[PDB]
Design a binder for these strands. Structure first.
Ligand SMILES: [Cl-]
Ligand SMILES: [Cl-]
Ligand SMILES: [K+]
Ligand SMILES: [K+]
Ligand SMILES: [K+]
Ligand SMILES: [Mg+2]
Ligand SMILES: [Mg+2]
Ligand SMILES: [Mg+2]
Ligand SMILES: [Mg+2]
Ligand SMILES: [Mg+2]
Lengths: 158, 160
RNA sequence: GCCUAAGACAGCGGGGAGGUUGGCUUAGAAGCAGCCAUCCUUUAAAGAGUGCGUAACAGCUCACCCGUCGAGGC
């Protein structure tokens, strides 16, 4: 058989217990080679929450580690440089990012997203941005979703 | 009639006249992440709209009637199940190949005929297969017919 | 008076997706203790989720879309 095991680790500091252990120790593959190979490919993302996918062949004890990108919530928080987002979204501001940065988060994540154009993936992100009381450019991120629609921002895109 | 139904038959009519080769495909039973994959992969090669079959047959019927050829009126013969109109310019053999290529493995269903062969797969066999992580049935957009210069192409013909 | 052979209503089957485990809180809070927001996308359509469930997940549901059936439902 083959077992795919999808888990959120802390980038760089993956351990052999729990999250990894109760999932991967069953399958009879060295739990440490995995914890190694995870901590190799998530050196960049040190200390942030990262998705990690372990594809194991149970018979042949053989595995591969396919690392992802952090939650866009985490990303937003990181360009802001912030611990914790709004306690009561849209009734306060956690911080404001530019449009340009939103484009960075958008451009960073387009492949996980199902919108095929960097416009609408920015629109997705915006939709996150609004979920935590971040403002994109003074405005409710909602507000600029429609501004993107009206073409107000067709200077950055293409 | 309903409001959207007049509007949405005109959308389908407009599509059929939009391009040369006009295919019916089937997206029934196909999981939604897997349709987003295919839909993304065929983006600039075909247009694909799903809609009620009774209405799909209407559109086809009036499209032909208004293009004054019978050989579109005959796609309505082959409309079943999850039937989506798909139109494009790539010829029916290349469209068979494209769509096949974007089939993706999936777990067989309980009661289903095992297409690789003939036999009904019990509920518990499949529940077990599904448990193991076995995915033996090739699934994706499924051609029912294609139209191309005065004739219909039925998968019967297209595979080999 | 409004839905209904352009298929209602009722049963059943398949879809029920992505950003994303939304933000917060929380030992844990993943649609589903609680507070806040409740957008964007792929769409036929699929709620930042109706009710189960879990310690949290899972799984099941439900909305909504397709499909069956064929005559009235209100
Ligand atoms: Cl023919
Ligand atoms: Cl469906
Ligand atoms: K994409
Ligand atoms: K259909
Ligand atoms: K959450
Ligand atoms: Mg179901
Ligand atoms: Mg909760
Ligand atoms: Mg609960
Ligand atoms: Mg939508
Ligand atoms: Mg949903």
């Amino acid at each position: 058989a083959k077992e795919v095991v999808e888990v959120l680790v802390t980038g760089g500091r993956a351990t052999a217990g729990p999250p990894l252990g109760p999932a991967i120790g069953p399958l009879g593959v060295n739990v440490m080679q995995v914890v190694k190979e995870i901590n190799e490919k998530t050196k960049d993302y040190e200390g942030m929450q990262v998705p990690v996918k372990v594809i194991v062949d149970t018979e042949t004890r053989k595995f591969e580690i396919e690392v992802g990108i952090p939650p866009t919530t985490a990303l937003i928080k990181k360009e802001l440089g912030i611990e914790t987002a709004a306690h009561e979204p849209r009734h306060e501001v956690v911080g404001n990012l530019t449009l340009e940065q939103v484009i960075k988060i958008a451009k960073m994540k387009k492949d996980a997203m199902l919108s095929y154009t960097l416009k609408n993936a920015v629109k997705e992100v915006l939709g996150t941005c609004g979920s935590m009381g971040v403002t994109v450019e003074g405005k409710d991120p909602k507000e600029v979703q429609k501004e993107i629609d009206a073409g107000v921002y067709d200077e950055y895109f293409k | 009639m309903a409001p959207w139904k007049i509007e949405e038959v005109k959308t389908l009519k407009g599509l059929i006249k939009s391009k040369p080769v006009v295919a019916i495909v089937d997206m029934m039973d196909v999981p939604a992440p897997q349709l987003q994959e295919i839909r993304d992969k065929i983006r600039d090669k075909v247009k694909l709209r799903m809609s009620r079959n009774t209405l799909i047959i209407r559109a086809l019927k009036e499209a032909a009637e208004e293009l004054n050829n019978p050989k579109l009126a005959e796609l309505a013969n082959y409309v079943e199940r999850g039937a989506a109109i798909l139109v494009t310019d790539m010829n029916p053999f290349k469209l068979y190949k494209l769509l096949e290529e974007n089939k993706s493995p999936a777990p067989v269903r309980g009661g289903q005929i095992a297409p690789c062969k003939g036999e009904v797969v019990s509920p518990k066999l499949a529940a077990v297969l599904d448990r193991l992580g076995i995915k033996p049935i090739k699934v994706g957009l499924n051609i029912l017919a294609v139209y191309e210069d005065g004739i219909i192409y039925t998968p019967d013909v297209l595979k080999v």
